[PDB]
Design a protein around this ligand. Structure first.
Ligand SMILES: Nc1ncnc2c1ncn2[C@@H]1O[C@H](COP(=O)(O)OP(=O)(O)O)[C@@H](O)[C@H]1O
Ligand SMILES: [Ca+2]
Ligand SMILES: [Ca+2]
Length: 69
């Protein structure tokens, strides 16, 4: 239910389907979705979820970001 919803949310931003949200994909999705965010804000959203520091948000980091209170 909520797990499936989180998976679809992740698939919204993993534009190429390789399992990692990159800064380029996030920028493209935000621009395509009509959201008003600067490029620095996109890079900051990536940095906040990037626990392992590889520069991309995998599925588990995304889950942590969504399921954290
Ligand atoms: N090259 C790959 N090798 C193994 N697993 C991959 C690969 N690319 C993506 N995945 C995994 O498969 C998931 C995407 O599955 P699916 O939705 O079937 O792909 P697509 O979005 O290409 O249709 C990703 O979230 C990731 O976990
Ligand atoms: Ca990707
Ligand atoms: Ca990462």
């Amino acid at each position: 239910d909520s797990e499936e919803e989180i998976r679809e949310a992740f698939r919204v931003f993993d534009k190429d389907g390789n399992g990692y949200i990159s800064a380029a994909e996030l920028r493209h999705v935000m621009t395509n979705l009509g959201e008003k965010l600067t490029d620095e804000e996109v890079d900051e959203m990536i940095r906040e979820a990037d626990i392992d520091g590889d520069g991309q948000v995998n599925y588990e980091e995304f889950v942590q970001m969504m399921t954290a209170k």
